Amino acid sequence: TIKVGINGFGRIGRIVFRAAQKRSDIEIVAINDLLDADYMAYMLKYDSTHGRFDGTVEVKDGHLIVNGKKIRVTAERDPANLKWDEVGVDVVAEATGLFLTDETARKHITAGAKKVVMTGPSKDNTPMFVKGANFDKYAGQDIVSNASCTTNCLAPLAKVINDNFGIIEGLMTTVHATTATQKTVDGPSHKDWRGGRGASQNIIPSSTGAAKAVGKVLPELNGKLTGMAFRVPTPNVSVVDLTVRLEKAATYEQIKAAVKAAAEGEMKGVLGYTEDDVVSTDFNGEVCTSVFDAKAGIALNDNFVKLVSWYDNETGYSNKVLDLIAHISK
Amino acid sequence: TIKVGINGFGRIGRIVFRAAQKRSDIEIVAINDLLDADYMAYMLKYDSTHGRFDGTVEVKDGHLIVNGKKIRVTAERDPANLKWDEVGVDVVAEATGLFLTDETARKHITAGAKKVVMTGPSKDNTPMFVKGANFDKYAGQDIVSNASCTTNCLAPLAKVINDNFGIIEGLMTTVHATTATQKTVDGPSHKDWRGGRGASQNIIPSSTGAAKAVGKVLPELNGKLTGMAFRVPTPNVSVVDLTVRLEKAATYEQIKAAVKAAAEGEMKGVLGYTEDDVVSTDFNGEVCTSVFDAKAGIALNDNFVKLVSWYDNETGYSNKVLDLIAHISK
Ligand SMILES: *[C@@H](O)[C@H](O)COP(=O)(O)O
Ligand SMILES: *[C@@H](O)[C@H](O)COP(=O)(O)O
């Protein structure tokens, strides 16, 4: 079993942990964040979006004890001092979002850890990997990125489409749920003015970390597609609205069959396919990082079409993070 | 002064009323709906979305008295006998969403009125007009349709883009604010299953008139444009996301200037232009039916671009309905 230390107990860190309990090839042994087991335990037992924790939580002498296993609670401001080797961690889930560079991220290895998987897109040229898109392209690296929730949604869908009909070009839009980096009411957001406005009252045009981030994970589509985001007042689960020009002509029924096929074989678990009259809440807790909404998309003609695909920016992403850990760990 | 009577005191009927108060060419003289002057006055005095009515509203003698002028309230489940001529109404603002056909709408002329403006996409062949797109094409028709709010936002923008660069093909998406037609919690919606789900908890894939309803008002784009909608948890103000491929290459600066020009010239008051860091609430009360969002849009290449335009689905459309009344009136 793989030992993993989580740096950052924010939204991602807490769900990465939850999703993990259900596994076997992985085990969280340490959690580091500027919070005490006491409070840290509380943010685990209660969740406004996903419900109460499924197991047991106890704080025994400065440390966590979930479902029996004892977790090591720390609070280091500087990674280097994490003394990860002590608790003996194989790979680190870097989820504080502060160390997205190799320079900074390496401080984990130095601290006794073998490899580090950033739970967000890298700020430098550190490799990025998205399950179902380029996982099989992993080259032993000891520091990697799992991109962003949107790229994880857009990448797989864009792949099967390109692979089957060839994408001449395409533009996207993701109707994004509210994240923690937004404000409850009109407040300060210097580098992002729009994103400072009341999150619950507005539709806020944003930018997305999946624009051409997909152009990196899937080089074949580099420079062939960008996008944006429209942050709306929901707590979780977003959706990508992809408009593409196809090389080989294809009927909508043809596109449906192509993704459904992928969702059932090659990309099973990553890509999903549905024909039901679904809405955002129906994907709360969804493990697939991209669930095709057959009935939603529209084709103008055989070479111009709009495809829709859901994703739980929390549950899907976090699950594939553990998947990336288990991969580089292979 | 044109004498107008409103049939249906819903969201539209009420905002149309408020807007008209500012005018000098039009006057509301009667209002029909299954509500009394009491309840009817109350819904005019207070509005969760637009604030308290600015002016005097008193219900003396079973009839409204707004800012002095006495309005005649009624309640006729059947328009056939509204006795419109007693009050001397020229044009009827058909805003019940009930009689969207010639026959049904005709009952308004049969009842004493001269012309009738349907405040919604017509179900039969009644011609639809959208200010800024084809108001010029009016041929005296006694019964007309002002299309829907999303068409009023899309039509103008599409025209200036088509006109200047020529739209080969295009697909849209409108992130729509909640409407009275939706349910507060998961409920019954026989014809629209997705639309019955909790309005405030979901991003709900939908369908939209504007789609090819634009192919009608704007004949040249017939079959070249279609789209959808995503109903989000906001009270008012939506936004169209138009992805089009141009015949004539155009840099984004060129598209900015063409739109800004239209807004400052031939389409002043219909098409609006902005370069600020705006969000939805910034357009609550907005009178233009299509405000271009410069910074939000994005160009992939000189022939494939995504354009963004805002609109107050209530205020904008309502104002133009009156603009249409005055048109066929002249
Ligand atoms: C998921 O990683 C975040 O909540 C949203 O970021 P994107 O760049 O839009 O995917
Ligand atoms: C404005 O007429 C309505 O609130 C929305 O209808 P659409 O068909 O989306 O324009």
From Swiss-Prot, chains A, B:
According to its UniProt entry, the protein's GO biological process terms are: glucose metabolic process; glycolytic process
E.C. number: 1.2.1.12
Active site per the UniProt annotation? C149
What name is this protein filed under?
Glyceraldehyde-3-phosphate dehydrogenase A
Classification via InterPro entries: GlycerAld/Erythrose_P_DH, GlycerAld_3-P_DH_AS, GlycerAld_3-P_DH_cat, GlycerAld_3-P_DH_NAD(P)-bd, Glyceraldehyde-3-P_DH_1, NAD(P)-bd_dom_sf
Site positions for Activates thiol group during catalysis: H176
For this UniProt record, give its keywords in alphabetical order, as a comma-separated list: Acetylation, Cytoplasm, Glycolysis, NAD, Nucleotide-binding, Oxidoreductase
What role is this protein assigned?
A: Catalyzes the oxidative phosphorylation of glyceraldehyde 3-phosphate (G3P) to 1,3-bisphosphoglycerate (BPG) using the cofactor NAD. The first reaction step involves the formation of a hemiacetal intermediate between G3P and a cysteine residue, and this hemiacetal intermediate is then oxidized to a thioester, with concomitant reduction of NAD to NADH. The reduced NADH is then exchanged with the second NAD, and the thioester is attacked by a nucleophilic inorganic phosphate to produce BPG.
* Residues carrying N6-succinyllysine: K114, K123, K131, K191, K212, K216, K224, K248, K256, K260, K330
Transmembrane stretches, start-end = none
Please give the family membership noted in the entry.
Answer: Belongs to the glyceraldehyde-3-phosphate dehydrogenase family.
Q: Which residues does the record give as NAD(+) binding sites? A: R11, I12, D33, R77, T119, N313
- Main site of residence? cytoplasm
- Provide the species name: Escherichia coli (strain K12)
Q: Where does D-glyceraldehyde 3-phosphate bind?
A: S148, C149, T150, T179, T208, G209, R231
Describe the protein's quaternary organization and the partners it interacts with. Answer: Homotetramer.
Modification N6-malonyllysine occurs at: K330
Localization per Swiss-Prot or TrEMBL: Cytoplasm
Listed under GO cellular component are: cytosol; membrane
Which of the residues bear the PTM N6-acetyllysine?
K131, K137, K191, K248
Q: Name one Pfam family in it.
A: Gp_dh_N
Catalysed transformations (reactions):
D-glyceraldehyde 3-phosphate + phosphate + NAD(+) = (2R)-3-phospho-glyceroyl phosphate + NADH + H(+)
Q: What is the lineage of its organism?
A: Bacteria, Pseudomonadati, Pseudomonadota, Gammaproteobacteria, Enterobacterales
GO MF terms held by the record: glyceraldehyde-3-phosphate dehydrogenase (NAD+) (phosphorylating) activity; identical protein binding; NAD binding; NADP binding
Q: In which pathway does it act?
A: Carbohydrate degradation; glycolysis; pyruvate from D-glyceraldehyde 3-phosphate: step 1/5
